[PDB]
Structure 1
């Protein structure tokens, strides 16, 4: 339970992977909205779980932060850089339209399915290792997935609002300035300036 001593919503029993009875706005009241909501939550969680390592590990290496690393495009002679190498197809329009139709094809291919459980857990070509063999080891893997994913969503929104608090800085830079003097470099000075 998300808050001990609080009654659960009726439609949220606790069988779904990750259900802790959290729904203060009662958004999942109607079941066919709840199905789509589970799907969209999993999609968001997966995107952010993929993104946050990508925000952190290049800045952990000798490259710019996640927002510096995407601002060459704001200049006319924009040329990308991967690992310190100017990529050939690096100008903005090439990048833009290749990304566009790539993602559009794969996303349409995704929402052309009507299971609706394989909508969230398709498997097959997306489960090479085959961790879906035991229906309850599978279930606790599901729980671990959505748990880590909610954590990663939290971490990402934290990253971006930190960025909006200290413009032109990276998350690891924020960790550094906090470790430099923990008792003086905290959220305090951004809440009470």
Structure 2
């Protein structure tokens, strides 16, 4: 669990997927707040997972680093409005229906294990995106793959001493 020896909040019993009893600020007391936060976390995880390879692949393929419009605005506004139109609390977190033609929802236990795996990978991808954003600030104009190569030059340490103490 989040850190052993700490009592968990009453609203986090360890039954929810990806739950580890983490709430040092207690921002999820109200049930409606918890449902909204669950949905928001799922959306963030999915977007970050979809985005990270789209940033990395350019540099690997040598096309460059990560550093029409009306159609895009219309499509995104329509998609988000249509998603917002849904009313069921359960269907918003997982819409199912025809969106999963491969039929991976047949097995319940496998479904729950997949849910836990997806949540964990989403947290990892979100942390990776934060890492990318902070990395760009320290070394302007340098992509993450070049930073990895420079680390491979000196595989000793995360070079924060060169930055934290100039």
* TM-score, normalising length: structure 2: 0.96
Q: 2:70 aligns with which of 82, 87, 97?
A: 97
Deviation at 1:23, TM superposition (A): 0.7
Secondary structure of the corresponding residue to residue 22 of structure 1: coil
Per the alignment, residue 80 of structure 1 pairs with none
Write out per-residue CA displacement over residues 37-82 of structure 1, whole angstroms, 9 at most, x where no aligned residue. 0000000000000011111112111111111xxxxxxxxxxxxxxx
- For 1:134 and 1:99, the matched residues in 2 are separated by 37
Deviation at 1:183, TM superposition (A): 3.0
Per the alignment, residue 117 of structure 1 pairs with 90
Matched, 1:171 2:135: no
Deviation at 1:181, TM superposition (A): 1.2
Root mean square deviation of aligned Cα: 1.2
Per the alignment, residue 34 of structure 2 pairs with 34
Deviation at 1:164, TM superposition (A): 1.1
Corresponding residue pairs, total: 166
Secondary structure of the corresponding residue to residue 182 of structure 1: coil
Secondary structure of the corresponding residue to residue 37 of structure 1: helix
Structure 1 runs (4+) deviating above 4 angstroms are: none
Contact 1:39-1:119 within 8 A present in 2 as well: yes
Matched, 1:134 2:107: yes
Per the alignment, residue 16 of structure 2 pairs with 16
- For 1:48 and 1:184, the matched residues in 2 are separated by 27
Deviation at 1:96, TM superposition (A): 2.3
Contact 1:177-1:185 within 8 A present in 2 as well: no
Which has more helix, going by share of residues?
2
* TM-score, normalising length: structure 1: 0.83
Secondary structure of the corresponding residue to residue 126 of structure 1: coil
Matched, 1:25 2:25: yes
Unaligned runs of 5+ in 2: none
